[PDB]
Design a protein around this ligand. Structure first.
Ligand SMILES: Nc1ncnc2c1ncn2[C@@H]1O[C@H](COP(=O)(O)OP(=O)(O)OP(=O)(O)O)[C@@H](O)[C@H]1O
Ligand SMILES: [Mg+2]
Ligand SMILES: [Mg+2]
Lengths: 147, 985
């Protein structure tokens, strides 16, 4: 529990994630506030997205609760910030680090999966009218993820 | 006509048909001693048609060793006559009678016959009749730490279900022409060779949709084969396969035939040569009793042991048994012939009651046929066990003194135990402790804690509670009942109503835990189990964990400095479906039930909470606007539930329910089909609505349909309850109101600055001020599965079935909906009895203070298949710290309340370790990577002051220690684990 959380925190500290920066809130180990930088080769370029990570008391035997805070226009992310990640609901195993979760979220941001969407309207726009999806994503990442 | 309010948990194990067939069966029980009374109690709680008792022998004192329906005022009265009255109260649907005399013909009046405490000649005489007339015959025996069970259900027993598992079902990706059926991605069918399956909804091969079962030839974890489907088609796409279970014919043998050539059931594979020894030993016991006017060998008597061994040799020679007799084991059976232990009685009674239920219901695979069990590892070795100590003292504990002696009785009578929970296992544990005389001495004591109250459904497996006690505290009732059973426990039992958790450390503190001898868990959740395990680890107290699940059960023992704790092992967690599956694309009824539960919470619980918090907290809106994920959603909920959609009568509630029906079952599906039409394709060209995704279809409100009306009634009633109106159930008003409804038009929308904050403020100021509404509160709906008059399960069932109709999923009834939504754990009385027996057999090892780890046995069993297994506990892991052997679990550092700097210096100088992280509770007290200013501010403070400052909460006066988790590195920088720190305040 606490020892595993601190091991992951130190591993993040020892090796800089470059594209991410996770740390405890205040002095509580069961509530982290991570930061993700928008991938360069994506509509979210030049954006900073804040994530809230809530470790369950049974960590790592139960998945952490990762929720977006900055608004994002993505097919697999809804307005509450819930992320459609298979490794967070039922595929979780006590062998995944927070760095792996952040890398998975960054990869998801790199390319969405509209075949199994979480926001059907955004997925429909992505599949049919790609240019309008690009414009909407740029507008959202310029209005919310900047400043 | 089964009373589902009482058999709620048992029906999830047996079923409606099994119980219907069970409630028409008669059971006769011969022998009303501890084993007989245990069997009768379990059968009465199960719910058979009636029970008849036959035991005309007058009561004696030693019979109180395991008979809990006998008192010292009943000495000299036949046991059946004084037990029938107390047995008749357990269940009101199961009459209990007594027969003064037994005749052979009379045996035809019964469906099952259980025989205990009977000679072998009488057993043969009974079985010779009950075998040729097709009557189930069970014979049970308990001698000291040994037990025997024999089952004979006839030569043509029909077993419909052989394992108790639900039929295996799965989804198919493709079926080739060679019969090769393939599952979907990363899906294991779980089938085995010889199983039967039937296919449905198969596209391209209609022939397989008939439903005829077909053989299974497993070829891999993901694919199997069914044979040749050449004629039916060339290739099949998609579909669902479901296993078919066929009846099995089991042929038994009579007792006379099976004495010569028995068929053993092995409860343990480490000792496979013993059952052949016990087979001779019990027959020799019967012969010795018949040769001495029914007198068993005296306890720990050498002459009787020699004579009994001579009888064993004679029997082994006569029956041509080519087995070498083990003299030590046989003479041990001789010594404990007069023993009567309540733990062995409980274990065997649970097993025999399960066998009776198998005989009546023709379900589960029975024992076939002999089952010989022993717990000889429980015999004490730290006390004197001889003829002098084991002779009877003329007290109610003679049956236990004959096995353990008087010194061990004095050891038991001074125990100071702590029982967590007072459920079914708690009641059984308290009964066993009362019978064993636990804490009946001067220095003994028992403490039982449980915060729950007695409900109707708890009376099925908790026999210490009566219908007149419904609504009272469990702990007080249990303590009173066990004080009634054993009068010596008057004033030796303390009952609390406290939940064992972090908030109860002021009651279960250092003083409370420093006087205990052992802790027994009777809980049902993992959080409390882990907490109690941590407390026991810190205080170094033995712990006894036990759990049941339907017909399965397990028991584990935690011994300080010997074995690992409860938290060192991991169990399969609960399954939570992906959010995208539940939200848009379900394919099973569980998804729809989960969605319905979320809908219930979001409609009748969350908005009411927001409204109530808005009217109470003066600064709620400002906090929500910058803290809540969707402040707009909160404002919309408050507005809608306060001003926009506040009902004034029940008609408006009905209108709102109709509107919500349209919102959730007609409009969202239209939007989804507008976004993803039924003919759309994925990026790879495959059709979108194929495989795990099922195309939905909107529902048009038809009032005459039962499901729509049920949803309307439930939703309207719950809304009225939220707003405190008068609900109604007459269909006339519903049909009158709903006729005059004009559906608002709906057309799906294709989509295509900082004014949003202005709109939010406009919505906020439109709400009435909190001052204008003083004392106005809305009642939230707290989910309650056990009450059938609150429309909770009805609403969930209606919503789930309507969503299933949307996606053409098979709807489920209210029974399965209550099972799934309520997270009901199936439970049985027999499993509880068995686990209590095993735990009480381990308790006598704990009392004796056995040191070797091979002398303790964790136990697992499954009564659906008659499986019992026992394995040694896993030893606690060791480690090397500074060239010393440290136990990982049971070792700690004891330190004063020194400053942080002094603690770091102590760890650097003594252990030669560099501290890099130090935490207490859920707070990070010290980390190596913190800015130097923070450390310079924190270093010169004491640990107690540091914790008070970081946690912003003063330490409670009853606090006497702190548990610190420390991670440190060695000199070279390699991480080394160290035990936790116990700072003494
Ligand atoms: N943290 C806890 N502290 C103390 N007692 C607890 C705790 N958690 C559970 N219990 C008690 O454990 C007992 C568990 O018994 P059991 O699960 O058979 O009953 P139940 O949960 O009331 O019934 P059912 O599960 O059949 O609806 C209950 O008395 C419950 O009060
Ligand atoms: Mg309860
Ligand atoms: Mg429970």
């Amino acid at each position: 529990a606490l020892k595993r959380i601190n091991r992951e925190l130190a591993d993040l500290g020892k090796d800089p994630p470059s594209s991410s920066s996770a740390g405890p809130v205040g002095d509580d180990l069961f509530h982290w506030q991570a930061t993700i930088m928008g991938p360069a080769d994506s509509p979210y370029a030049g954006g900073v997205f804040f994530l809230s990570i809530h470790f369950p008391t049974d960590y790592p035997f139960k998945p952490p609760k990762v929720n977006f805070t900055t608004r994002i226009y993505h097919p697999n992310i809804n307005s509450n910030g819930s992320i459609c990640l298979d490794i967070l609901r039922d595929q979780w195993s006590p062998a995944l680090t927070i760095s792996k979760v952040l890398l998975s979220i960054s990869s998801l941001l790199t390319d969405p999966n509209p075949d199994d969407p979480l926001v059907p309207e955004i997925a429909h726009v992505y599949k049919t009218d790609r240019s309008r999806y690009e414009l909407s994503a740029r507008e959202w990442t310029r209005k919310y993820a900047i400043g | 006509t089964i009373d589902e309010g009482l058999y709620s948990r048992q029906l999830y194990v047996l079923g409606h048909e099994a119980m219907k067939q069970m409630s028409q069966s008669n059971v006769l029980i011969i022998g009303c001693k501890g084993l007989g009374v245990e069997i009768a109690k379990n059968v009465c709680l199960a719910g058979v048609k009636s029970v008849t008792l036959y035991d005309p022998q007058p009561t004696r004192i030693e019979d109180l060793s395991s008979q809990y329906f006998l008192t010292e005022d009943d000495i000299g009265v036949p046991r059946a006559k004084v037990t029938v009255s107390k047995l008749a109260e357990l269940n009101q649907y199961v009459p209990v009678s007594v027969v003064d005399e037994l005749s052979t013909e009379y045996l035809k009046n019964f469906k099952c016959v259980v025989v205990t405490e009977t000679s072998l000649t009488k057993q043969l005489e009974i079985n010779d009749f009950t075998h040729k007339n097709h009557i189930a015959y069970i014979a049970a025996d308990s001698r000291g730490l040994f037990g025997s069970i024999f089952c004979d259900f006839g030569e043509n027993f029909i077993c419909t279900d052989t394992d108790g598992n639900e039929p295996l079902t799965g989804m198919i990706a493709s079926i080739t022409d060679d019969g090769v059926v393939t599952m979907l991605e990363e899906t294991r069918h779980g089938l085995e060779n010889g199983d039967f399956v039937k296919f449905t909804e198969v596209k391209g091969m209609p022939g397989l949709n008939d439903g005829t079962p077909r053989k299974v030839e497993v070829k891999g974890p993901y694919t199997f084969s069914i044979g040749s489907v050449k004629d039916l088609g060339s290739a099949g796409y998609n579909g669902v396969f479901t296993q078919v279970k066929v009846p099995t014919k089991i042929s038994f043998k009579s007792l006379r035939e099976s004495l010569k050539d028995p068929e053993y059931v092995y409860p343990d594979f480490g000792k496979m040569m013993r059952p052949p020894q016990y087979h001779i030993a019990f027959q020799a016991l019967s012969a010795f009793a018949d040769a001495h006017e029914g007198s068993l060998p005296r306890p720990r008597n050498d002459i009787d042991a020699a004579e009994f061994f001579e009888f064993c040799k004679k029997i082994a020679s006569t029956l041509q048994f080519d087995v070498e007799l083990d003299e030590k084991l046989i003479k041990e059976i001789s010594y404990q012939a007069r023993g009567d232990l309540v733990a062995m009685s409980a274990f065997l009674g649970g097993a025999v009651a399960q066998e009776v239920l198998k005989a009546t219901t023709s379900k589960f695979y029975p024992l076939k046929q002999y089952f010989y069990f022993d717990s000889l590892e429980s015999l004490p070795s730290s006390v004197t066990i001889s003829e002098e100590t084991c002779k009877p003292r003329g007290c109610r504990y003679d049956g236990q003194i004959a096995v353990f002696g008087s010194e061990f009785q004095e050891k038991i009578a001074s125990l100071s135990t702590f029982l967590v929970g007072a459920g079914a296992i708690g009641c059984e544990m308290l009964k066993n402790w009362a019978m064993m005389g636990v804490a009946t001495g001067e220095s003994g004591h028992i403490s039982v804690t449980d915060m729950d109250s007695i409900e109707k459904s708890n009376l099925n497996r908790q026999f210490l509670f009566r219908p007149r006690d419904v609504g009272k505290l469990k702990s007080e009732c249990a303590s009173t009942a066990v004080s009634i059973m054993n009068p010596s426990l008057t004033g030796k039992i303390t009952s609390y109503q406290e939940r064992v958790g972090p908030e109860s450390e002021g009651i279960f503190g250092d003083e409370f835990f420093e006087k205990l001898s052992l802790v027994t868990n009777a809980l049902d959740n993992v959080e409390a189990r882990m907490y109690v395990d941590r407390r026991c680890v810190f205080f170094e107290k033995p712990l006894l964990e036990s759990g049941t699940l339907g017909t399965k059960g397990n028991t584990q023992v935690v011994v300080p400095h010997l074995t690992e704790s409860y938290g060192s092992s991991q169990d399969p967690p609960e399954k939570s479906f992906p959010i995208c599956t539940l939200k848009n694309f379900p394919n099973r009824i569980e998804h729809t039930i989960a969605w319905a539960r979320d809908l219930f919470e979001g409609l009748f619980k969350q908005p009411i909470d927001n409204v109530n918090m808005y009217l109470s907290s003066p600064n709620f809106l400002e906090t929500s606007l910058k803290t809540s994920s969707n402040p707009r959603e909160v404002l919309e909920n408050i507005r809608d539930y306060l001003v926009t959609e506040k009902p004034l009568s029940f008609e408006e509630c009905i209108m709102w329910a109709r509107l919500q029906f349209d919102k959730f079952f007609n409009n969202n599906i239209q939007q989804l089909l507008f976004n993803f039409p039924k003919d759309s394709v994925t990026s790879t060209g495959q059709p979108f609505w194929s495989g795990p995704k099922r195309a939905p279809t909107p529902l048009s409100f038809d009032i005459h349909n039962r499901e729509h009306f049920d949803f309307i009634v439930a939703a309207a009633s719950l809304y009225a309850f939220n707003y405190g109106l008068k609900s109604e159930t007459d269909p006339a008003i519903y049909e009158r109101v709903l006729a005059g409804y004009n559906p608002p038009p709906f057309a799906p929308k294709s989509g295509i600055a900082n004014k949003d904050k202005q709109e939010l403020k406009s919505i906020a100021d439109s709400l009435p001020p909190p001052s204008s509404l003083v004392g106005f509160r809305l009642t939230p709906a707290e989910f309650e599965k056990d009450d059938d008059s609150n429309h909770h399960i009805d609403f969930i069932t209606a919503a789930s079935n309507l969503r299933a109709m949307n996606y053409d999923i098979t709807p489920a009834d209210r029974f399965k909906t209550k099972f799934v939504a309520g997270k009901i754990v199936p439970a049985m009385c027999t499993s509880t009895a068995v686990v209590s027996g095993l735990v009480c057999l381990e308790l006598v090892k704990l009392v004796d203070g056995k040191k070797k780890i091979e002398e303790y046995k964790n136990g697992f069993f499954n009564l659906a298949i008659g499986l019992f297994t026992f394995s040694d506990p896993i030893a606690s892991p060791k480690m090397k710290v500074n060239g010393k052997e440290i136990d990982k679990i049971w070792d700690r550092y004891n330190l004063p309340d020194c400053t942080l700097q002094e603690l770091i210096d102590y760890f650097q100088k003594e252990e030669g370790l560099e501290v890099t992280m130090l935490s207490s509770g859920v707070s990070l007290l010290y980390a190596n990577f913190q800015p130097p200013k923070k450390l310079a501010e924190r270093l010169p403070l004491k640990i107690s002051e540091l914790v008070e400052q970081i946690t912003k909460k003063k330490l409670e006066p009853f606090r006497k220690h702190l548990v610190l988790e420390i991670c440190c590195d060695d000199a070279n920088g390699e991480d080394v684990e160290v035990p936790f720190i116990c700072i003494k305040l």
